[PDB]
Design a binder for this molecule. Structure first.
Ligand code: NA
Length: 121
């Protein structure tokens, strides 16, 4: 139906936005802590700590399938990269200190993404 096709193009334009939002946040992590899912060969106890792992590659695979139906679903995953990192890794670690700065600089993008999905609809 034409109502379904108008629904699908709207998703197709959200995805384009959430890609460009995704591209912007990964620049804030330039040396790539959060590029990849934590290796369960290098970190065999990780799933004892963190029940919902996330990373930019996982977020990009979800995105290109059109699996982000809104901006809230995208933010939960971005938040999960920051949040899981800041629990596993301690404060004097650069990992926590890299997660902190992605949050802080990623806020100015997620504020300036919230009001982009919005009116665009
Ligand atoms: Na901790």
């Amino acid at each position: 139906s034409m109502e379904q096709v108008a629904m699908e193009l709207r998703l197709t334009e959200l995805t384009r936005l959430l890609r460009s939002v995704l591209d912007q946040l990964q620049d804030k992590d330039p040396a790539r802590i959060f590029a990849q899912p934590v290796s369960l060969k290098e970190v065999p106890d990780y799933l004892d700590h963190i029940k919902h792992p996330m990373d930019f590659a996982t977020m990009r695979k979800r995105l290109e399938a059109q699996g982000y139906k809104n901006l809230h679903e995208f933010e939960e995953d971005f938040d999960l990269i920051i949040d899981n990192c800041m629990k596993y890794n301690a404060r004097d670690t650069v990992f926590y200190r890299a997660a902190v700065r992605l949050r802080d600089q990623g806020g100015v993008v997620l504020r300036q993404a919230r009001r982009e999905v919005d009116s665009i609809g």
